Design a binder for these strands. Structure first.
Length: 51
RNA sequence: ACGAGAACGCAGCACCAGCUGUCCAACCUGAAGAAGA
């Protein structure tokens, strides 16, 4: 008979799996001043470009 | 100078009454973004 054993994932290491791909820095910011990176949303960017 | 002549087989009348094209059934099965960029 089926049972229930709850399991967790203490991902001590960083993870990568594929769901898609993106090209060079045309919609994401790769800063180097304070060493941070950024990825954009969609709707706010659309409104920003509209204005 | 016909066993003759004259004489609508015609008049009234709903192929109609009741009746679920319904019942059961999963659009379901099997299938890593890796890899020497």
């Amino acid at each position: 008979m089926k049972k229930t054993y709850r399991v967790t994932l203490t991902a001590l290491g960083p993870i990568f799996i594929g769901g898609g791909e993106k090209l060079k820095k045309y919609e994401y910011i790769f800063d180097k001043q304070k060493k941070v990176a950024h990825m954009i949303d969609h709707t706010k960017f659309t409104k920003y470009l509209l204005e």
